[PDB]
A paper describes a structure:
Here, we present two crystal structures of Bradyrhizobium (sp. XS1150) NopD complexed with either Arabidopsis SUMO2 or ubiquitin at 1.50 Å and 1.94 Å resolution, respectively. The C-terminal carboxylate group of SUMO2-PA or ubiquitin-PA can thus be crosslinked with the active site cysteine of NopD (Cys971) to form a stable covalent product complex after incubating NopD with either SUMO2-PA or ubiquitin-PA. Our structural studies uncover that in contrast to Xanthomonas XopD, NopD shares the same binding interface for ubiquitin as it does for SUMO. Thus, in the NopD complex, a different interface is formed compared to XopD, as indicated by a ubiquitin displacement of approximately 5–6 Å when superimposing both complexes. In ubiquitin, Trp889 is located in a pocket formed by Ile44, Gly47, and His68 (all distances around 3.5 Å); whereas in AtSUMO2, Trp889 is located in a similar pocket formed by Leu60, Gly63, and Asp84 (all distances around 3.5 Å). Another interesting feature in the NopD-ubiquitin structure is the presence of a strong well-oriented electrostatic interaction between ubiquitin’s C-terminal Arg72 and NopD Glu840. Glu840 is a unique trait in NopD essential for binding to ubiquitin, as observed in the complex structure engaged to ubiquitin’s Arg72. This interaction is not present in complex with SUMO, and cannot take place in complex with Nedd8, in which Arg72 is replaced by an alanine. Notably, our functional analysis indicated that the NopD E840A point mutant is only relevant for ubiquitin, in contrast to AtSUMO2 or AtNedd8.
Numbering used by the authors:
A (entry chain B): 1 to 75
B (entry chain A): 828 to 989, 991 to 1011
Write the structure that this text describes.
């Protein structure tokens, strides 16, 4: 199935995923296209950050959902 | 966790975890004030200033400002675009919406003026007038995130009691923060 990942600049990354895919698997798929290491990524859905060990289906993320990518912060 | 070293810069993971702890504490001790208050995820706070208005309006819908009296936003200066610029500094914006006609965003920066550009962007997106607010200034190169977190907790205590928003007398404790996150 298809999901979309929206960047802070508004760019859309299109991923091909399964409901059984872990969040970590999704971050790897983002790395495959953008080159961003998974340890720098955060993924947000419905206002909540997604934990690397859960699956898409755990968060009720279904076909054509949009996730938001925000890279890690420090200061 | 996440655990935090003695001189380690705070990441968004440390700020968010303490904000979750605080959010749960407040809903237990003062559920009425907790319903009126948003402790905004630092990542969502950056989305609020996104150059993409579709991204910002999503972040606005998660914050739900229209029903809040107070918004606490950790302000990072990380880049929106550059993967290699993940931030240098944390500051705190408290938006007081109680008077829906003159909302004010109080900016507490432990290096005065550092994040003022970004603070003004956030306040504009939240329909607030920016006002620099006093906080004790940092004495080392690593504790700005602790000023943000302990400043938030002290302000919450002051808002519960009726007021004084001067944080010049703020006492911070990295030790107590490391204990909160580690437990």
């Amino acid at each position: 199935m298809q999901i979309f990942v929206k960047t802070l600049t508004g760019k859309t990354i299109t991923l091909e995923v399964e409901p059984s895919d872990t969040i970590e698997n999704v971050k790897a798929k983002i790395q495959d296209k953008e080159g961003i290491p998974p340890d720098q990524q955060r993924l947000i859905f419905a206002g909540k950050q997604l934990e690397d060990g859960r699956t898409l289906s755990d968060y009720n993320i279904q076909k054509e959902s949009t996730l938001h990518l925000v890279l890690r912060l420090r200061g | 966790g996440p655990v935090l070293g003695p001189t380690q810069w705070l990441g968004d993971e440390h700020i968010q975890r303490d904000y979750e702890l605080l959010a749960q504490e407040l809903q237990q001790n003062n559920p009425d004030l907790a319903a009126r208050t948003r402790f905004v995820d630092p990542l969502i706070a950056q989305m609020l200033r996104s150059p993409s208005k579709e991204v910002a309006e999503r972040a606005l819908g998660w914050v739900r400002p229209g029903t809040a009296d107070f918004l606490f936003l950790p302000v990072s200066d990380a880049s929106d675009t550059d993967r290699h610029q993940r931030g240098s500094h944390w500051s705190l914006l408290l938006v007081d919406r109680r008077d829906r006609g003159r909302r004010v965003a109080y900016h507490y920066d432990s290096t005065q003026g550092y994040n003022d550009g970004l603070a003004a962007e956030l306040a504009g997106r939240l329909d607030a007038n920016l006002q620099q607010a006093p906080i004790r200034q940092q004495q080392n190169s690593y504790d700005c995130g602790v000023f943000v977190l302990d400043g938030t907790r002290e302000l919450v205590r002051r808002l519960a009691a009726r007021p004084d928003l001067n944080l010049n007398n703020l006492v911070i404790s990295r030790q107590e923060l490391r204990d909160r996150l580690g437990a």
